[PDB]
């Protein structure tokens, strides 16, 4: 029940994590996570209903989505937990994260195809089924579309924002959530997706296993922000059209509300917070 920095995983943990992910893929369960994500990415709009992204619920929604995935992994191997990727620290193509024994590296320049690691198309173990770009192999272009990953300094500026979110509660909002998501400011979360490239830069981003590690760290940053701002909390708190208020339930689960996810310790703890 402890989420660890990917850079600290043991050979066995990396092996077990990879095997569990591959089994969810084989059984067909994995693709459904990709499909669900793409559905919300496609429906969440700044002028209307928005639940998964560009809205205050971006954080609690992804927290629950990751819990769903982690629980699926644990149903295969109960010792497995979602590790997190601190992109402010491990910012190069040489991070152990991109080694052949973990996620594999960047894609070749010709077609962006990943050629090593357990998720390379050549293994016959990672078909890209849920897709828009008709190609069926995992693709990446680390640092191709955007020069640099967020720095610790930039992350710090965002963690310093006191307000969780602010009206109009969308991509135009000032405040922590939108600055963390990246639609405004130095850009943290959005920039990481762009930096990885390939499927990670699309609506079907969960096709790349790194998606979970990326969001596991974004999730950790929310928990850190809470520690710095004990006097701030989730908003809005009631009667906001098209936005998930604190005590309102969230789709697709319908049985959980942001209020039920604010405290991560009810589900897991971090190696270090």
């Amino acid at each position: 029940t402890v989420r660890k920095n990917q850079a600290t995983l043991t050979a066995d943990e990396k092996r077990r994590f990879v095997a569990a992910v591959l089994e969810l893929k084989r059984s067909g369960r994995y693709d459904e996570f990709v499909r669900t994500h793409n559905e919300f990415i496609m429906s969440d709009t700044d002028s209307g209903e928005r639940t998964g992204h560009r809205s205050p619920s971006f954080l609690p929604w992804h927290r629950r989505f990751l819990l769903d995935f982690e629980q699926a992994l644990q149903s295969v191997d109960s010792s497995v937990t979602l590790p997190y990727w601190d992109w402010s620290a491990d910012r190069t193509v040489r991070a152990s994260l991109w080694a052949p024994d973990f996620l594999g590296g960047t894609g070749r320049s010709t077609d962006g195809r990943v050629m090593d690691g357990p998720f390379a198309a050549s293994t016959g173990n990672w078909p890209i089924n849920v897709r828009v770009d008709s190609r069926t192999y995992l693709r990446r272009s680390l640092g191709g579309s955007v020069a640099e990953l967020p720095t610790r300094a930039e992350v710090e500026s965002v963690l310093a924002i006191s307000a969780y979110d602010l009206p109009p509660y969308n991509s135009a909002s000032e405040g922590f959530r939108n600055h963390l998501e990246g639609w405004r400011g130095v850009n943290l979360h959005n920039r990481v997706h762009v930096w990885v490239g390939g499927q990670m830069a699309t609506g079907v981003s969960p096709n790349d296993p790194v998606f979970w590690l990326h969001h596991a760290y974004v999730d950790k940053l929310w928990a850190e922000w809470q520690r710095r701002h004990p006097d701030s909390a989730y908003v809005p708190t009631g009667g906001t059209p098209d936005v998930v208020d604190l005590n309102e339930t969230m789709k697709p689960w319908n049985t959980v509300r942001p209020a039920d996810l604010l405290d991560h310790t009810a589900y897991y703890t971090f190696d270090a917070l």
Binding site: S145, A172, G203
Partner: protein, 71 residues
């Protein structure tokens, strides 16, 4: 006030845009695109990288596809 329509061949592929709120096609296949509050645009194949216009989004898609047909 939706943007104007467009039709051109970009990197050997035909890209078209037209007000619906706005539709984009790559070689006759529709591409999901979205407008942000600040006026920028994104598409399903480049959803985390805002660009100034729908044509910019279509061109970004063609770039991303590297010749591959759109589903």
């Amino acid at each position: 006030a939706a943007p104007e329509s467009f039709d051109e061949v970009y990197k050997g592929r035909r890209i078209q845009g037209r007000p619906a709120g706005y539709e984009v096609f790559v070689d006759g296949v529709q591409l999901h695109v979205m407008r942000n509050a600040d006026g920028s645009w994104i598409s399903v194949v480049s959803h985390y990288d805002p660009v100034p216009t729908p044509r910019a989004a279509a061109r970004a898609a063609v770039d991303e596809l590297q010749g591959a047909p759109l589903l």
